[PDB]
Design a protein around this motif. Sequence first.
Motif, PDB file in Angstrom:
ATOM      1  N   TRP A 103       0.803  -1.129  -0.108  1.00  0.00           N
ATOM      2  CA  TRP A 103       0.093  -0.054   0.020  1.00  0.00           C
ATOM      3  C   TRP A 103       0.982   1.066  -0.123  1.00  0.00           C
ATOM      4  O   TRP A 103       1.852   1.347   0.669  1.00  0.00           O
ATOM      5  CB  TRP A 103      -1.085   0.047   1.286  1.00  0.00           C
ATOM      6  CG  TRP A 103      -1.842   1.229   1.096  1.00  0.00           C
ATOM      7  CD1 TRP A 103      -3.002   1.458   0.561  1.00  0.00           C
ATOM      8  CD2 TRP A 103      -1.648   2.428   1.550  1.00  0.00           C
ATOM      9  NE1 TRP A 103      -3.544   2.440   0.457  1.00  0.00           N
ATOM     10  CE2 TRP A 103      -2.641   3.358   1.043  1.00  0.00           C
ATOM     11  CE3 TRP A 103      -0.727   3.291   2.233  1.00  0.00           C
ATOM     12  CZ2 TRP A 103      -3.156   4.666   1.163  1.00  0.00           C
ATOM     13  CZ3 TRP A 103      -0.834   4.486   2.527  1.00  0.00           C
ATOM     14  CH2 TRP A 103      -1.851   5.196   2.082  1.00  0.00           C
ATOM     15  N   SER A 108      -4.810   1.141  -3.605  1.00  0.00           N
ATOM     16  CA  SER A 108      -5.562  -0.140  -3.535  1.00  0.00           C
ATOM     17  C   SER A 108      -6.323  -0.628  -4.607  1.00  0.00           C
ATOM     18  O   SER A 108      -6.204  -1.503  -5.158  1.00  0.00           O
ATOM     19  CB  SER A 108      -6.297   0.055  -2.263  1.00  0.00           C
ATOM     20  OG  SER A 108      -7.650   0.596  -2.282  1.00  0.00           O
ATOM     21  N   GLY A 284      -3.063  -5.578  -0.588  1.00  0.00           N
ATOM     22  CA  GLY A 284      -1.582  -4.995  -0.897  1.00  0.00           C
ATOM     23  C   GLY A 284      -0.770  -6.284  -0.868  1.00  0.00           C
ATOM     24  O   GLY A 284      -0.735  -7.137  -1.289  1.00  0.00           O
TER      25      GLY A 284
END
Length: 312
Positions: A103, A108, A284
């Motif tokens: 991330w 995202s 992630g």
Amino acid sequence: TIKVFTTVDNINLHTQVVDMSMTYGQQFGPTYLDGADVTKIKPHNSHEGKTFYVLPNDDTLRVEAFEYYHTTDPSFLGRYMSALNHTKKWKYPQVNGLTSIKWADNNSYLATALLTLQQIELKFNPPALQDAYYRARAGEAANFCALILAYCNKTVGELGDVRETMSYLFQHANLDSCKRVLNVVCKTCGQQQTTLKGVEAVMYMGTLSYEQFKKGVQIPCTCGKQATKYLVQQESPFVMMSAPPAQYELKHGTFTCASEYTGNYQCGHYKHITSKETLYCIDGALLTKSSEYKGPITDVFYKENSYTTTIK
Ligand SMILES: C=CC(=O)Nc1ccc(C)c(C(=O)N[C@H](C)c2cccc3ccccc23)c1
Ligand SMILES: [Cl-]
Ligand SMILES: [Cl-]
Ligand SMILES: [Cl-]
Ligand SMILES: [Zn+2]
Ligand SMILES: [Zn+2]
Ligand SMILES: [Zn+2]
Ligand SMILES: [Zn+2]
């Protein structure tokens, strides 16, 4: 004077002799080094022999830019390089055999798209996108991610939608074979079939269930009544079913992968659910598994080749 290579595609390279006194800009126009704008910078000794992207400023380079990127938009290069300047600093860990993104910078939606693209059959028309897609699949996804931003007209940090991003990428892909025949049945107006091709053949907005699309869904009719839209024939290697996020049950083995979306319109968080030997949830760099899943889903991807309904 050092000597450098200028390019727009990083395939055709051109030898230049640059003045060490003059900025790159004075000599070539806008000039970038691995994403970093160096227009206003003078040439350092350690620049010797390196390759710089330039904005096309002759017919040769405009033609090479169109052949590599499939765009003449003069902002395209600068937007690609501004994005790459960040995406080259993101981490791309392997998670459950897929290249994900750790991330950063509200990415995202890009990670969810990137994971999805590794699980569906797609050929990109621009060689830039095809080459970067192969490199991303093998673990080096920085260029691909920067190109997704440039092609979607998104900057790093901007809030993005996976369905919108997939739509733009599918418009850059060879989906001509893809064919969708629909039947609409109204009490008054009667029955009307329509045939969709390309992107509109593989995307639907309104339900997540491919099965429900086959059984029919209730849509407004121009006459004023509700009507039934149902799928007659599908020819595509996958379909993408989307709807506004809602609690939904995902069953192992009944879908390829799905977009989970949590929070308010625009400023929420995406995660990716993929159906393997069990259900994996990729957030992630983070991975969890379970045999069951219920949660807020907005996209579901399914395999297809050829489907014809058993409805008269
Ligand atoms: C066009 C302007 C625009 O900014 N688009 C866009 C950009 C970025 C994001 C994250 C979204 C978005 O929130 N997408 C989710 C999946 C979503 C889709 C549809 C309906 C929804 C209803 C309630 C909540 C979420 C809903 C939309
Ligand atoms: Cl070039
Ligand atoms: Cl084109
Ligand atoms: Cl294209
Ligand atoms: Zn050339
Ligand atoms: Zn094209
Ligand atoms: Zn950044
Ligand atoms: Zn009608």
